[PDB]
Design an enzyme around this catalytic site. Structure first.
Site, short mmCIF file in Angstrom:
data_model
loop_
_atom_site.label_atom_id
_atom_site.label_comp_id
_atom_site.label_asym_id
_atom_site.label_seq_id
_atom_site.Cartn_x
_atom_site.Cartn_y
_atom_site.Cartn_z
N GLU A 1 -4.33 -4.28 9.44
CA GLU A 1 -4.75 -5.33 8.52
C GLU A 1 -6.18 -5.85 8.71
O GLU A 1 -6.83 -6.13 7.71
CB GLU A 1 -3.74 -6.49 8.48
N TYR B 1 -4.84 -10.30 10.30
CA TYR B 1 -5.74 -10.25 9.16
C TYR B 1 -7.11 -10.84 9.49
O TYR B 1 -8.12 -10.14 9.45
CB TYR B 1 -5.12 -11.05 8.00
N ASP C 1 9.41 -10.01 10.96
CA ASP C 1 9.31 -10.71 9.67
C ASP C 1 9.08 -12.21 9.87
O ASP C 1 8.35 -12.83 9.09
CB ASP C 1 10.56 -10.47 8.82
N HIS D 1 -6.17 0.47 2.48
CA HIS D 1 -5.09 0.87 3.39
C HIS D 1 -4.87 2.40 3.37
O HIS D 1 -4.35 2.95 4.36
CB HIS D 1 -3.80 0.15 3.04
N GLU E 1 0.77 -1.25 0.00
CA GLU E 1 0.00 0.00 0.00
C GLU E 1 0.81 1.31 0.00
O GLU E 1 0.27 2.34 0.45
CB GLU E 1 -0.91 0.00 1.23
N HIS F 1 -7.90 -4.10 -1.55
CA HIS F 1 -7.27 -4.21 -0.24
C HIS F 1 -6.27 -3.09 -0.02
O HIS F 1 -6.34 -2.43 1.01
CB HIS F 1 -6.58 -5.58 -0.08
N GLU F 2 -5.33 -2.88 -0.97
CA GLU F 2 -4.32 -1.82 -0.86
C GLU F 2 -4.96 -0.44 -0.96
O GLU F 2 -4.46 0.50 -0.33
CB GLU F 2 -3.19 -1.97 -1.89
C1 LIG Z 1 -4.09 -9.51 1.92
C2 LIG Z 1 -3.68 -9.55 0.45
C3 LIG Z 1 -4.77 -8.91 -0.39
C4 LIG Z 1 -2.33 -8.94 0.10
C5 LIG Z 1 -1.22 -9.19 1.12
N1 LIG Z 1 -0.65 -7.87 1.39
C6 LIG Z 1 -0.98 -7.09 2.42
O1 LIG Z 1 -1.82 -7.39 3.26
C7 LIG Z 1 -0.27 -5.77 2.51
O2 LIG Z 1 -1.21 -4.72 2.78
C8 LIG Z 1 0.82 -5.80 3.57
N2 LIG Z 1 1.16 -4.44 3.96
C9 LIG Z 1 2.09 -6.52 3.10
C10 LIG Z 1 3.11 -6.62 4.22
C11 LIG Z 1 2.78 -7.16 5.47
C12 LIG Z 1 3.75 -7.24 6.48
C13 LIG Z 1 5.05 -6.80 6.25
C14 LIG Z 1 5.38 -6.25 5.00
C15 LIG Z 1 4.41 -6.16 3.99
C16 LIG Z 1 -0.21 -10.17 0.60
O3 LIG Z 1 -0.45 -11.39 0.72
O4 LIG Z 1 0.83 -9.73 0.07
ZN LIG Z 2 -2.85 -5.07 3.97
#
Ligand SMILES: CC(C)C[C@H](NC(=O)[C@@H](O)[C@H](N)Cc1ccccc1)C(=O)O
Ligand SMILES: [Zn+2]
Ligand SMILES: CC(C)C[C@H](NC(=O)[C@@H](O)[C@H](N)Cc1ccccc1)C(=O)O
Ligand SMILES: [Zn+2]
Lengths: 606, 605
Positions: free
Chosen positions: B314, B379, B371, B295, B267, B291-292
């Site tokens: 999330e 989520y 991480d 955000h 996002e 989704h993004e």
């Molecule tokens: C939920 C899905 C639509 C997409 C999901 N991405 C996200 O939720 C993003 O908003 C997240 N911001 C991706 C992220 C999470 C934790 C650390 C670094 C980056 C993904 O799986 O990449």
């Molecule tokens: Zn997200």
């Protein structure tokens, strides 16, 4: 670029201010050590232009060395420009800290110094500021344009026996290690504000809680009647939040000033300044609170880019205020205040002239003194446009949705009439055909009355229009027909309206205003709005008996809305002319500098 | 405040950043000249503590002075702190400018430097960043905590054909002086953002307008299929604005990254980062955009105070995303994505442990690598709470009113779960009686599955649960009963659900996964979400024939959601173990640093 300022907001912006203010009542001075965080908007900028007016700049320091500063030619009303040579040309949008040591003049247009003899408590002196529109430059060197919004922190040094308050949250008291006779009050303003919203009060003040986020501040003598008059402040703040969204300022305090305050209300963030002239003991003039509360959104959160765009501030606030009146007294009262607005706009267009470019909704203020340009046009022509749009787009509920999204869209930013119109069309994208029907040129850049009149409910107004007509068309033989019954069934707002329509017509005979006093006894009405109109009507009529009453109201209070017209009318009155000039000179030193300059120009004194 | 940062947000606040970034592809480093506007929150500040990770600090200058700086005791993952001891004690509410000259390491966890052979064909090199959660330290010295939100302006020196983009509005093109093998692309971000939201991409990029505030950025080869897949971006942006309120960021651009991007979506304000793994040619995996977009409100506009409060970001975004999908594809589909969410949560709880304190909605992250702590818990347990509250408080229309006021209440600020719960009780002052009935301890600080399950519509799910049940209870004699009829009229999301069901169930015999291939032909399905689950199921079954397919998908794409489990499962598979270890040792240099590091923990080393 603001035509009322010397500063260029397109070249740079002040993002934060750290204020070290030394308040000296013996010198009538505020010595300020201002630390300005400057952000460059133009590449390789060499100079820094700030607004000053009757200010003495001691030294300027950029990153600790001493910068070469230079004051320009003193303008007729804009003040003097101050140019600062930076040691390095920067790399936009680079930020730097500019430290400036200044001192005000005792004549500072923003401030009013009162001796204990002038005040109510009679033991201590008093100080209060009025920076709107362009008087912040009379306190500190700044980009005195509402286009630049900055956060601030201040430390205020005052005599230890006195209280100090600012348009910010209180952040504690500190001990002045250098002077034992002094205290240091500290304040935090973490919401970006424009310079006109900077405020300071120093005096013998007392405050008591009247809500979970409202303390009422004033001198002990005025405290007891102020808490009754403004008891419903929280109710008004809650009603406003329901309409506009959350209150982001944290605290909503009120301060009732001496009668010399030049306005009725001032929306200083965290501390609204109110006139004692609204204390009528019945809360009939308490809509001033709902109006100032509404500025927390339209004005303070979403600011007008320049004073040319002042209607975005006052027109939307007047709309919000009248919606709070709606949920209060009813839709019929809302419609009546809307119709009374049209008459005040009609009252202002005649005073300035139906052809005066100053009566345009978005006026040209190039080489124009903003204090001398103040009118009900941005208020009522601005409101009329929003109320006409409301009727055209589907009602108040549908139009409120737009206002809510508008506040959210531009929160913490400054706005032009063009940005507002682009957002209005973006929001009403499906209703864009109804928007293209409005005469935008006639509404925005045409002097006088608006092109179209909105549909109003006439239930409360009908009695006012009838009585006024009866008085202007009455002969000496009809005078006997008038009785107490004519005004007996009328509210205070209804009495204001009938007087306003009498003032808008030709001057009445001396016999008619004598007959008014006989059956309506308007000489003993304490209600300021009624009394001012009643006295003004008598002066134009040429009644000699009203001269000591008009002089009394013009000198016992200093609210420009009342004092300035009473003095003007009294001067144009041949029989009174001598006494009024002599009354003004004897009170010239005891009045506010803005009220004084404007009343002296009117009287051909200066 | 944040146990993931060494910086103190209670002592001082970074209000603005001016970034002069020098990017050199030969050295694979970013030399940054950062000018930080520091606001003191304490009465007498002498020191300045900032977060760094594998950063080299050349010099520090506070308002034009050769300032002295020292580094403390090094940390396992947080990094080594940077103390700037100020010459004069700053006062409460005073601002100062701190200029810092730094340079990144080529191993920088935030960046990925892929060769001309790794890019589309053989034309030019490529660079892209991934800051969230705590990798902004690996680029510039900062208060790398979402609690501190600042505005920024940047100038980046890049080659002529290699166009540069940042998580900000474009502010024009310009030229350089000495070391001419570069070109200036300037950007402005006037909305305060946390450090995890700064972004940078440098490569051979091309764009195309698909809306008034949307331009899709990709390589020429990926451009044509990206515009078809994300054609409905404006519609999604408008649908989101109807729900959340006005979009304050001005523009909404998209960037499709090389397959090595570790996530599906990111996002970054004004420029959403998207994986090429969602390009299925049918927009079935395009909810990533919804989704993004969401955000832009819950995350960017209203930020989580710390990563312990990550569910506010999330959980609310998953809720908003499913409200948009419910408007595009109906309430029936919305209910189905909610039910599929419950199944994804039970998969994460299964992996981390039903008793793991990391599975609490608000977990304790003291001495925890964020991480390595990433899961579907913030989520889905987060979404489930909001969807359970919705049913309890009067429906979606009533719950949306709350979300709208919540966004407005905390816009441009950071939030704790305590602030969120206090706001929920103030908004629903009329329903405190039904609010005191929810099991808050069970929802916020209890590991495993949530205390109560929300009521779901089973219309679309009924066919998925039936098929899964038939497959786990089938004997060799029943295999003949299964046909193409079982899946051919199910949607892609219905096929994802039946596979997810099967993956939570006991390992299937080799004969059953062989029959699946025979009647459903799942080996030639291009859809990434279906393929990943299908391959994982076959590895779980002990089917040797799937080893070269699982290795292929794990190395041709670097999205952690897919690559990390495929590698783990392949390692635990005795017959594959040797080849899988040797396959990562041959691809070790060509992977993202966050993706490449987590194999030392999974593949043991
Ligand atoms: C939920 C899905 C639509 C997409 C999901 N991405 C996200 O939720 C993003 O908003 C997240 N911001 C991706 C992220 C999470 C934790 C650390 C670094 C980056 C993904 O799986 O990449
Ligand atoms: Zn997200
Ligand atoms: C609408 C009324 C009840 C209140 C009215 N006051 C206002 O509109 C204020 O909020 C304005 N801030 C008054 C003002 C305008 C321009 C320069 C200086 C001061 C007043 O009469 O003072
Ligand atoms: Zn006003």
């Amino acid at each position: 670029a603001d035509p009322s300022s010397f500063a260029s907001p397109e070249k740079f912006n002040i993002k934060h201010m750290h204020l070290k203010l030394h308040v000296d009542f013996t010198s009538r001075a505020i010595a300020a050590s201002t630390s300005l965080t400057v952000r460059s908007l133009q590449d390789s900028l060499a100079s820094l232009i700030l607004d000053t007016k009757d200010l003495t700049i001691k030294k300027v320091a950029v990153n600790g060395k001493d910068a070469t500063f230079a004051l320009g030619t003193t303008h007729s009303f804009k003040g003097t420009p101050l140019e600062i040579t930076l040691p390095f040309s920067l790399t936009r949008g680079q930020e730097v800290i500019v430290e400036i040591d200044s001192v005000t003049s005792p004549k500072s247009s923003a401030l009013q110094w009162l001796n204990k003899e002038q005040t109510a408590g009679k033991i201590h002196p008093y100080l209060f500021s009025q920076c709107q529109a362009t008087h912040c430059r009379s306190i500190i060197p700044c980009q005195d344009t509402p286009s630049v919004k900055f956060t601030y922190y201040s430390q205020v040094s005052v005599p230890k026996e006195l209280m100090a308050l600012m348009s910010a949250l209180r952040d504690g008291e500190l001990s002045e290690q250098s002077d034992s006779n002094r205290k240091i009050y500290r304040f935090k303003q973490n919401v970006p504000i424009p310079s006109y919203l900077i405020a300071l009060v120093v005096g013998a003040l007392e405050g008591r809680k009247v809500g979970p986020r409202t303390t009422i501040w004033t001198e002990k003598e005025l405290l007891e009647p102020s808490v009754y008059e403004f008891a419903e402040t929280e109710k008004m703040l809650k009603y406003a939040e329901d309409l506009a969204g959350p209150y982001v300022w944290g605290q909503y305090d009120l301060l009732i000033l001496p009668p010399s305050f030049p306005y009725g209300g001032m929306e200083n963030p965290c501390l609204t300044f109110v006139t004692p002239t609204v204390l009528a003991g019945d809360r009939s003039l308490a809509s001033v609170i709902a109006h100032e509360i509404s500025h927390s959104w339209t004005g303070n959160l979403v600011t007008n880019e320049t004073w040319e765009n002042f209607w975005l501030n006052e027109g939307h606030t007047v709309y919000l205020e009248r919606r709070i009146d709606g949920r209060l007294y009813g839709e019929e009262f809302r419609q009546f205040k809307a119709l009374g607005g049209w008459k005040e706009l009609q009252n202002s267009v005649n005073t300035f002239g139906a052809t005066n470019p100053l009566t345009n909704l978005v006026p040209n203020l190039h080489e124009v003194d903003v204090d001398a340009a103040f009118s009900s046009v941005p208020y009522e022509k601005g409101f009329a446009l929003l109320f006409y749009l409301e009727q055209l787009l589907g009602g108040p509920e549908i139009f409120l949705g737009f206002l809510k999204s508008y506040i959210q869209m531009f929160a913490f930013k400054s706005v032009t009439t063009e940005e507002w119109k682009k957002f209005l069309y973006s929001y009403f994208k499906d209703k864009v055909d109804i928007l293209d029907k409005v005469d935008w040129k006639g509404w925005m850049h045409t002097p006088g009355m608006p092109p179209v009149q909105p549909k109003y409910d006439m239930t409360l107004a009908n009695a006012c229009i009838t009585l006024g007509q009866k008085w202007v068309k009455a002969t000496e033989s009809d005078l006997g027909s008038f009785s107490a019954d004519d005004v007996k069934d009328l509210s205070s707002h209804q009495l204001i309206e009938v007087l306003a329509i009498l003032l808008l017509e030709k001057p009445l005979p001396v016999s008619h205003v004598k007959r008014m006093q006989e059956v309506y006894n308007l000489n003993d009405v304490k209600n300021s709005e009624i009394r001012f109109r009643w006295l003004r009507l008598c002066i134009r009529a040429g009644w000699e008996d009203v001269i000591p009453l008009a002089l009394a109201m013009a000198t016992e209070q200093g609210r420009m809305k009342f004092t300035r017209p009473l003095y003007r009318d009294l001067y144009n009155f041949e029989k009174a002319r001598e006494q009024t000039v002599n009354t003004f000179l004897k009170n010239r030193s005891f009045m506010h500098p803005v009220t004084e300059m404007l009343v002296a120009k009117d009287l051909h004194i200066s």
